[PDB]
Structure formats: C-alpha cells, structure tokens
Amino acid sequence: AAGTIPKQVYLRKRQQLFQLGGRGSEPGSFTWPRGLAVGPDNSIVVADSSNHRVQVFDSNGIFVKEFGEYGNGEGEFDCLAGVAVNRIGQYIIADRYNHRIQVLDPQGRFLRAFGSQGTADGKFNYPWGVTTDALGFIYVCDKENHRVQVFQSDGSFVGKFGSCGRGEGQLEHPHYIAVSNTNRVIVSDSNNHRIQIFDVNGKVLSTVGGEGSDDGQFKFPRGVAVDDQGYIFVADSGNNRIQIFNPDGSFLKTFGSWGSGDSEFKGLEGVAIMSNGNILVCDRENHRVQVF
C-alpha cells in the first residue's frame, strides 16, 4: 500500500465493489439497517435495526456472526440504531428504544449496560448513534436531547455537550458521530444541515457544510465517518448522496442518487470507512450495505 494517494482513490469513487443484505431476517439478510461500523480487520458490523440484532462480516463480505434479539433484557435490543467497536474489539450498541447503551465482548456476549430514559446526566431520550475514541471513551448522540454525552468504558458519565438550537455549538436531532484519531468529535447535525466538529471537552472547532443541494451542502445529513488523515465522509440523505471532504473541510467528491441499483440509495443511514479506503454505506430502505 506504500505509494497510495488517498485523494486520487477517493476521487475515483462511484462504482460499488460488492453489496450485502437483501430483505429478510435470516443470517446475512437485513430488514431496515441503520448503523454500521468497521472492526479490527476491517470487518463490516451492521446494526440490523428491525431484526433487533447486530451482524458481523469480514472485510470481503463473508458473514461471520450475529447477536441479539428483541427485548429489554441483557443482550436484547429494541430497535437499535448505532453501533461501534473499540480497540479491544468489544461491541458498543445504542439500544435506541430502551434508551440505553449495551457493551458486549468480541463474541457478542453481554458485559454491561447503562442509561435509562431522561434528560438527566447519563439518561437518554432516543440514543441513536455511538462511537469510540482511542482510549475507549464512549460518545453517544441522544438524538431527542439534542446533545452528545461521553462516558468511560464502564459507563461512568464523564461529560456532555451541545444543546437544542441552531447556533454555534448547538444541535437539532443529531443522528450520527465519529471521533478522529486527533480526538476531534464529528457530529452530523441533521436538522441544521451541517457537520459540527468539537474537541473532546465540548469546544467547537469548526463546521462543515450547510443547507443546500450544491456540492458541499447537505439535506439532513445522516452517517459520518472520518479516516486516519481526517477525510470526512457524509451520508447526505436528503440529497441521496455520499459526500467526501478534504481534511481541511473543503468539498472533494460526491457520488450517488435516489434509486435501488448499483450506487443508488434510498434512506441513507450509517457510514464507515475501511483503512484501505473502502467506503461503507448503509442503504436502509434497500435493506442493503454497499461497499465502495
């Protein structure tokens, strides 16, 4: 991989390499998938929301394992949306309709849960959307509280930031986030049609994009990912596009349109980026994950 020019790789993005899913509840099928994440060896981890489960695939698409079932018990999920994998390989699920986070081990066995519905510190309204920083700190978007709450690996509350509003440092219904290896917190601020970037302590660092349909503009951004150089990847759901941004925030590339064939989307949700430049998009109403 030594001579790779990332910018050139990203600018060639359009044609799907392969896809995953198809409607159903058997292993390898999805129902209305929302969050996805990449794992250690570039594994593809899918929040299979309406099947109340996570499914894990290797970097070439081969199904590996699934875990979870409907419920409010330990290791059960109501209608999960967000998923993530930390450096230790344990699975971190935003169990949306139970208003809690569950952390499972690399084999999908239950380790701990935390949170319940509420506005208070450590309490969530509709969690939807989670990620991990290098030290194992958990960052949640509780969508309906218009904020980001950060926890320790054991669930201990640590801090929070953002609040309802349309201004500097505010959020309206944020769905998805990512933390870069620079420890900048990258929040898709859905209804403000913008990407918000904070440091770990809640200080606004910059803003990417704004409302519109031109290059560099968003209509209801959903999934976000960041690569190891700071390229930012956005599911521009309102405009039926993936957008890619240079590490300085400037528009680089866009691809996709409303549809259900190769490179077409309906209901863009989560987004993830493999360390080889493969972009992963969750295509909710087509019950599939597409890889570019």
Residue numbers in the entry: 1062 to 1353
Please share excerpts from the published article on this structure.
Causative mutations in human LGMD2H cluster in the NHL repeats, suggesting that this region may mediate protein-protein interactions important in disease prevention. We previously showed that mutations in Drosophila TRIM32 also show progressive larval muscle degeneration, despite modest sequence identity (~42%) across the NHL domains. To gain molecular-level insight into the functional conservation between the NHL regions in fly and mammalian TRIM32, we obtained a crystal structure of TRIM32_NHL at 2.6 Å resolution (Rwork/Rfree = 18.2/22.8%). We then used the TRIM32_NHL structure to construct a model for mouse TRIM32_NHL using SWISS-MODEL. Indeed, the superimposition of these two structures demonstrate that the NHL region of Drosophila TRIM32 is a faithful model to understand NHL function. Briefly, the C-terminal region of Drosophila TRIM32 containing all six NHL domains (AA 1061–1353) was fused in-frame with an N-terminal Glutathione S-transferase (GST) tag. To this end, we expressed and purified His-tagged Aldolase (Ald) or His-tagged Phosphoglycerate mutase 78 (Pglym), both of which were low or absent in control pulldowns. Both Ald and Pglym were found to directly interact with the NHL domains of TRIM32. Collectively, these data demonstrate that Ald and Pglym interact with the NHL domain of TRIM32 and in vivo, a subpopulation of these post-translationally modified glycolytic enzymes can be found in a complex with TRIM32. Another possibility, which we favor, is that the NHL domain of TRIM32 serves as a scaffold for the subcellular localization of glycolytic proteins to limit diffusion of substrates during glycolysis.
Of the known factors that promote muscle development, TRIM32 is an intriguing candidate for coordinating metabolism with cell growth. This protein is a member of the Tripartite motif (TRIM)-containing family of proteins defined by an N-terminal RING domain, one or two B-boxes, a coiled-coil domain, and a variable C-terminal region. In TRIM32, six Ncl-1, HT2A, Lin-41 (NHL) repeats comprise the C-terminus and are proposed to mediate the diverse functions of TRIM32, including cell proliferation, neuronal differentiation, muscle physiology and regeneration, and tumorigenesis. A single mutation in the B-box region of TRIM32 causes the multisystemic disorder Bardet-Biedl syndrome (BBS), while multiple mutations that cluster in the NHL domains result in the muscle disorders Limb-girdle muscular dystrophy type 2H (LGMD2H) and Sarcotubular Myopathy (STM). Our data show that TRIM32 promotes glucose metabolism through the stabilization of glycolytic enzyme levels.
